[PDB]
Scaffold this active site. Structure first.
Site, mmCIF file in Angstrom:
data_model
loop_
_atom_site.group_PDB
_atom_site.id
_atom_site.type_symbol
_atom_site.label_atom_id
_atom_site.label_comp_id
_atom_site.label_asym_id
_atom_site.label_seq_id
_atom_site.Cartn_x
_atom_site.Cartn_y
_atom_site.Cartn_z
ATOM 1 N N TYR A 1 3.758 6.637 9.900
ATOM 2 C CA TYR A 1 2.817 5.484 9.472
ATOM 3 C C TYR A 1 3.733 4.315 8.944
ATOM 4 C CZ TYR A 1 -1.580 2.896 8.694
ATOM 5 O OH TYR A 1 -2.249 2.124 8.683
ATOM 6 N N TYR B 1 -10.152 5.380 7.475
ATOM 7 C CA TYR B 1 -9.940 5.598 9.041
ATOM 8 C C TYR B 1 -11.093 6.736 9.069
ATOM 9 C CZ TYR B 1 -5.756 3.438 10.124
ATOM 10 O OH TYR B 1 -4.673 2.551 10.350
ATOM 11 N N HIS C 1 0.784 -1.491 -0.105
ATOM 12 C CA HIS C 1 -0.068 0.022 -0.141
ATOM 13 C C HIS C 1 0.809 1.445 0.000
ATOM 14 C CE1 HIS C 1 -3.920 -2.102 1.516
ATOM 15 N NE2 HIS C 1 -3.562 -2.341 0.079
ATOM 16 N N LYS D 1 0.861 -0.310 15.441
ATOM 17 C CA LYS D 1 2.401 -0.220 15.695
ATOM 18 C C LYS D 1 2.782 -1.927 16.606
ATOM 19 C CE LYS D 1 3.521 3.155 13.551
ATOM 20 N NZ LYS D 1 3.324 2.173 12.256
ATOM 21 N N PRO E 1 -4.358 -0.155 18.707
ATOM 22 C CA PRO E 1 -4.310 -0.415 17.290
ATOM 23 C C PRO E 1 -4.424 0.409 16.322
ATOM 24 C CG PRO E 1 -6.360 -1.103 18.720
ATOM 25 C CD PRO E 1 -5.083 -0.616 19.620
#
Ligand SMILES: Cc1cc2nc3c(=O)[nH]c(=O)nc-3n(C[C@H](O)[C@H](O)[C@H](O)COP(=O)(O)OP(=O)(O)OC[C@H]3O[C@@H](n4cnc5c(N)ncnc54)[C@H](O)[C@@H]3O)c2cc1C
Ligand SMILES: Cc1cc2nc3c(=O)[nH]c(=O)nc-3n(C[C@H](O)[C@H](O)[C@H](O)COP(=O)(O)OP(=O)(O)OC[C@H]3O[C@@H](n4cnc5c(N)ncnc54)[C@H](O)[C@@H]3O)c2cc1C
Lengths: 391, 391
Positions: free
Chosen positions: A385, A201, A72, A297, A293
């Protein structure tokens, strides 16, 4: 029996360390409390950083991942009517994240180890640690009903949050930092094709939602639910209804619903222990820290701990520089805290909190409007990220 | 009497609007409650953004500023033993901030106006607003003891936090967002040479400190003190002692102490009102919003409101497009909130808060370690500090 390094917990942190070590000649024995299929039953993690991906390749277990993992280049964040994408590739210096289930990762490491002929004792109950501070520490356990004694040089406690390892260090020696969020995550795994080629998200007045995937024909969806909520009150019907309610119209109308394969509530928490060792016991993975979550990580931090531990152990075994193991916690915690600050941040800007005044809500919205519109702000999320560099 | 625009409050927001308007032909009358020397007695603001600097030039009052103002290319942040500098010039695309007192700014705008022959009625007590929603609004006040009636087209409430303007709008029409910080700022102005060519912000276990300047031979220092503290308990001696205690050894040993010219406690607060207008009354400056001084934005936001208001008023007077004044609050609030998010952030990462657990403290330290070490993180502070673009 006897060995060099003894690993507690046959989860991803343990098998990744057992593999790395075996491949380097350093013998190790893994002890697990549960059955292989129970360890295999945990859906958990789905998003992996590049550091972890390369680490699996150095462990020689990456065939399957490189074939089925979806790479991704960017994610999405949805809030207040608009969906905003984060191009992780350009914004992070060319890095990306790989989508590949933890169940798979474990399945892969497990086959790898089975083939290697290396030791693995499942259903190893009543595990107790002994003489952590002496030159010779040992681990005793029950198999069926007989007490066995495993003798080793170093014990690696990779037994998760609720493991025996962290419990085996003198309470006075460890300083704990912990934060429990007043909400949980209702996870739902379906055998349906995902709603987006990339993750979404979403911050909505009803609460947080997230649209993940495991492959082209398998999806993983989450909604934010209070801690007093039980999974049984949440039927398939109502979950889909709720999710649709929390997402963009254009995204909800594309959604392909379907029966759940797994359903459960993950309670959020932040946890860091300091330090991460005691004599010859070094903690790695959830045995030392927990991160909400939201940031993806947990597993990725477990990999960095493990990487540092293997590397330091090699320097000590072959290179005969055992003094270096003293800087474990120093090295690890550095990355751990930075990860935790991003995990807490992600969690605070995407979740609706109970009893929030008008000022904080306006600040949350602005936190999003700025960070998702400033080229410097997008970058901060992007590099965090994909994951910060291993030191 | 009669006029076009009537301005309430002869502070920086009001005189900057009165000047801009006069210079464009649009007549205005300024009403102030206090004496010129009382308005001149407020030490307040010291750090100006570039947008404001150019704005003063367009108002024609910049001779003195361009001669005595100190241009700054970067600031410093001190925390946990180390001092970290932020190079604002490169990190912001080439922008910088100017150090020049508010007292001076006011002194300059005041002379400018005095020369212009434009109206200014100080000691104008009992100010009341009337017919805000009608085509003809009016402002009545007492001079010595006689009731005078000023007739105008638009009233501009630039009368500060505690002004009559915001009080004159129907409570139901305004939605307020407010946050009061449990600490204050003890300001101290000395006629001593500053401790650094650039500003130092310091987070220390005793509390926040800040080392500012007004010129090469005049300094402005602040320490963080609780709200129950009175300025009289804080002598010169103890202030210097305290400050030194809160700064780096290397910085404290260079410090030149000396008698105070001014000493006072500024209580911190966050405040935003929505919207910023009612009929023919438009609020600007502290009459609409307050931001904690940490970020150096109050005056700078007042300038952007004022800039937008002058610009919109010109479009309405000469260009005959009065419909445009409806989008005032829409335009302003956009910048206001982003400024507020940075002001709150600066305040939360540099101040020690009462009753903070171990987890938040660790997060604060990490907030600093990340943002001051990531090139993307430094940028976010840099562009926010020099100021975001006027829309
Ligand atoms: C819903 C959810 C989603 C997540 N998603 C992401 C994601 O997308 N990306 C990401 O990076 N992270 C994510 N995480 C985190 C990740 O799942 C964990 O960090 C990871 O499982 C930890 O690996 P570990 O090996 O330390 O722990 P574990 O997975 O906890 O396994 C530890 C093993 O120790 C065993 N054990 C326990 N006690 C003993 C004992 N006394 N003796 C022997 N064996 C013992 C247990 O049975 C277990 O088998 C997620 C977590 C959750 C809950
Ligand atoms: C310690 C401190 C430091 C600061 N430092 C910075 C900095 O470095 N940089 C920065 O950008 N900002 C800073 N600020 C903020 C800045 O000082 C204010 O935002 C600014 O003064 C507001 O301008 P104004 O014209 O809206 O308000 P004001 O300065 O409040 O003046 C308003 C005027 O209205 C008058 N008045 C009140 N009621 C009436 C009435 N009924 N009728 C008529 N007149 C009335 C008052 O007497 C006053 O004269 C700081 C603030 C403080 C407290």
């Amino acid at each position: 029996m006897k060995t060099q390094v003894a690993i507690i917990g046959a989860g991803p942190s343990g098998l990744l360390l057992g593999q790395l070590l075996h491949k380097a000649g350093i013998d190790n024995v893994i002890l697990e409390r549960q059955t292989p299929d129970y360890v295999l039953g945990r859906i958990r993690a789905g998003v992996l950083e590049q550091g972890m991906v390369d680490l699996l390749r150095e462990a020689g277990v990456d065939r399957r991942m490189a074939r089925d993992g979806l790479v991704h280049e960017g994610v999405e964040i949805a809030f207040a009517g608009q969906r905003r994408r984060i191009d992780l590739k350009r914004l992070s210096g060319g890095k990306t994240v790989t989508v590949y289930g933890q169940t798979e990762v474990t399945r892969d490491l497990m086959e790898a180890r089975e083939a290697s002929g290396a030791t693995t004792v499942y259903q190893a109950a009543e595990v107790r640690l002994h003489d952590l501070q002496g030159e010779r520490p040992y681990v005793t356990f029950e198999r069926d009903g007989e007490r066995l004694r495993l003798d080793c040089d170093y014990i690696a406690g990779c037994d998760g949050f609720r493991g025996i390892s962290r419990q085996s260090i003198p309470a006075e020696r460890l300083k704990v930092f912990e934060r429990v969020y007043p909400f949980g995550w209702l996870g739902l795994l379906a055998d349906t094709p995902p709603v987006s080629h990339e993750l979404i998200y979403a911050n909505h007045p009803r609460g947080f939602a997230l649209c993940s995937q495991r492959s082209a024909t398998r999806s993983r969806y989450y909604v934010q639910v209070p801690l007093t909520e039980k999974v049984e009150d949440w039927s398939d019907e109502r979950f889909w209804t709720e999710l649709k309610a929390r997402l963009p119209a254009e995204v909800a109308e594309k959604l392909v619903t379907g029966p759940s394969l797994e359903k459960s509530i993950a309670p959020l928490r932040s946890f860091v222990v300091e330090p991460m060792q005691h004599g010859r016991l070094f903690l790695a993975g959830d045995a030392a820290h927990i991160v909400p979550p939201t940031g993806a990580k947990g597993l990725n931090l477990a990999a960095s701990d493990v990487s540092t531990l293997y590397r330091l152990l090699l320097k000590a075994y072959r290179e005969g520089r055992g003094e270096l193991l003293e800087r474990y916690s120093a090295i690890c915690l550095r990355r751990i805290w930075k990860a935790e600050r991003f995990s807490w941040w992600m969690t605070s800007v995407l979740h609706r909190f109970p009893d929030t005044d008008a000022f904080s809500q306006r600040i949350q919205q602005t936190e999003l409007e700025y960070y998702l519109g400033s080229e410097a702000g997008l970058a901060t999320i992007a590099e965090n990220y994909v994951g910060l560099p291993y030191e």
